[PDB]
């Protein structure tokens, strides 16, 4: 994963060590045979020694000690709320000051510095370049001349920091030149400053989607987003870069619709008609360039491609007045035209009500528009400002203002090949946006000016409620049992939790809980009106109900409340 650390007995503050290979607590001091870290396969290396902690089974014997890491012992250990659990779940106790393994064992261990448990924190992989190993990460550890390595070796063999990549270095000899994060862009990254951003060319590399985005998390980065044509003339005449590679493009992580990793807008577009926003293979819910072509195709997300990371560089009110009929919404005056016709002619409309089309800046604005303006016919589509001239793509307002949300529906936005204007318009529940003919006689909206929450506390703004996340994770109920009262809170929830978490591993925290285990789950203080579970959920009876990114952002899936920590979400001013 990451970072050494000290395993501290619950009972007694004590730092557990081994001497001539077998347990026993001692007195934490500051040096280095008190350190672990984790390594693959769910063992804990002790550093000074280089040997795995490790549980010989074999017959009854149950006995705990040091192993060689490449042993056939049992040297796997999760975690159980505190306790520390190998085979069979024996967990590892203290006896006299004295390693043991024994079942239903009380013993609590904690990591010394911080209190959480041992695996709070999640196994960090770390990719390659170049090497002979096309991008595959490194396998800690590795042995090498008697040395069992357990991070990236600095050596006068290898251009930078370097590892192994499987499980027998001496023999298959496939490494890689370790991909760690960084602070300047230099020699593992590329000025450039007209778009204000360093880039990496992971060339010779071949990774899933998944992957890919975890590679350049874990840089600090990001997968590509192009948001321009000027980005994506650059990247079709760059030389010696894979003519196809991963882009932050992508249909997996969104609630729907496509969307770039990174959260930059989606209103630059350049789709390959042969495979395009809706895919031809059903499921394809990722995105590469051809940078030959210059086009962008939906794929499968499982397909070992190269990739580019991307990462930027730093520098150095309460009510307005409308005309009636009007609906009053931060400083703006929205007004809903029900005589369907054109994009062009609806536009000049909105200019003959001294007004434009609507831009749409924020769910709070999507929100209101939904469930205000009209409420009725979901089902026809209504015209927004959004709207194309050029290609490749380029959406954009009519009125000017930037292009800060593109809230796309599924397979959205669906460009047409060769074939401008395209118009944006927006129907179904939730106000999504799709594509559209600028002939459609729809509906529209026009849009005219009219006339506590300290940043600091935390607070987030979303029309009226303010909302904040905790940045510790904890065990239910600890700072606010939330409620999530309707579709759109949820969407903006997913919003908040996919801007957090970059990781996509947190779990945040709901207010529903099941209190007696008899299968109602309810608001932990309102009816539970709008449900969001997760696939096979809820799962089982008395549990507490929390929310992740990723494949299912925000779905509910119920979780242990005696042991199960998240992030709290939490709100006020109703």
């Given amino acids: 994963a990451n970072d ?54 074999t017959k009854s014997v149950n006995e705990l000690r040091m192993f060689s890491c490449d042993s056939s012992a049992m040297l796997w250990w999760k975690c159980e709320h505190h306790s520390l659990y190998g085979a069979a779940r024996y967990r590892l106790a203290l006896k006299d000051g004295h390693g043991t393994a024994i079942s239903n064992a009380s013993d609590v261990w904690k990591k010394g510095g911080s209190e959480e448990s041992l695996c709070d924190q999640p196994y960090h992989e770390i990719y ?49 030149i370790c991909l760690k994060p960084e602070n300047g862009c230099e020699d593992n990254w590329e ?71 990174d959260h ?15 895919p031809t293979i059903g499921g394809s819910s990722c995105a590469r360039m051809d940078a030959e072509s210059g086009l962008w195709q939906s794929f499968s997300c499982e397909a070992q491609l190269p990739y580019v990371c991307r990462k930027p560089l730093n520098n150095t009110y309460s009510d307005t007045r409308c005309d009636a009929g009007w609906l009053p919404n931060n400083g703006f005056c929205y007004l809903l035209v029900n005589e369907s016709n054109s994009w062009d002619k609806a536009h000049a409309k909105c200019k003959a009500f001294s007004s434009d089309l609507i831009s749409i800046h924020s ?16 089902k026809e589509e209504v015209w927004i400002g959004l709207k194309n001239i050029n290609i ?49 006689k729809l509906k529209y909206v026009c849009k005219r000016k009219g006339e506590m929450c300290p940043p600091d506390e935390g607070w987030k703004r979303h029309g009226e409620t303010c909302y904040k996340i905790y940045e510790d994770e904890v065990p239910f109920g600890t700072n606010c049992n939330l409620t999530i009262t309707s579709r759109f809170e949820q969407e903006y929830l997913n919003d908040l939790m996919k801007k957090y978490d970059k990781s996509l591993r947190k779990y945040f925290w709901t207010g529903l809980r099941d209190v007696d285990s008899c299968g109602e789950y309810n608001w932990a203080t309102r009816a539970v009106t709008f449900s969001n579970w997760n696939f096979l959920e809820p799962a089982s009876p008395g549990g507490c109900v929390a929310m992740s ?16 920590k998240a992030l709290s979400i939490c709100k006020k001013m109703s």
Avoid: M
Wanted: negative net charge.
């Fill in 191 to 261: 000025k450039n400053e007209q778009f204000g951003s360093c880039y990496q060319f992971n060339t010779q590399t071949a990774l899933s989607w998944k992957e890919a985005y975890v590679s350049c998390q874990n840089q600090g980065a990001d997968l590509l987003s192009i948001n321009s044509a000027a980005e994506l003339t650059y990247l079709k005449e760059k030389e010696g870069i894979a003519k196809i590679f991963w882009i932050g493009l992508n249909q997996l992580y969104s609630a729907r619709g496509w969307e770039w990793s």
């Fill in 128 to 176: 390659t370049r170049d090497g002979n190993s096309y991008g595959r990460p490194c396998e800690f550890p590795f042995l090498i001349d008697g040395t069992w390595h357990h991070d990236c070796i600095l050596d006068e063999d290898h251009s930078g920091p370097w590892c192994a990549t499987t499980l027998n270095y001496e023999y298959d000899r496939k490494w890689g």
């Fill in 363 to 378: 769910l709070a604005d999507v929100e209101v528009v939904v469930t205000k303006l009209h409420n009725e016919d979901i």
């Fill in 392 to 440: 490749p793509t380029l959406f954009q307002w009519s009125d000017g203002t930037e292009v800060t949300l593109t809230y796309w529906d599924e397979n959205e936005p669906n460009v047409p090949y060769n074939k401008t204007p395209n118009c944006v318009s927006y129907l179904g529940e939730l106000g999504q946006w799709k594509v559209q003919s600028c002939e459609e």
């Fill in 264 to 278: 930059k807008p989606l209103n630059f577009l350049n789709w390959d008609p042969d495979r395009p926003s809706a």
């Fill in 549 to 564: 990114t990723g494949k299912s952002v925000g779905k509910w899936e119920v979780k242990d409340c005696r042991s199960f």
């Fill in 4 to 57: 050494p650390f000290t395993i501290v007995h619950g009972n007694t503050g004590k730092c557990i060590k081994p001497v001539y290979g077998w347990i026993v607590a001692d007195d934490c001091d500051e040096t280095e045979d008190k350190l672990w870290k984790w390594v693959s396969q769910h063992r804990l290396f002790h550093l000074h020694s280089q040997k795995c902690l490790g549980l010989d089974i």
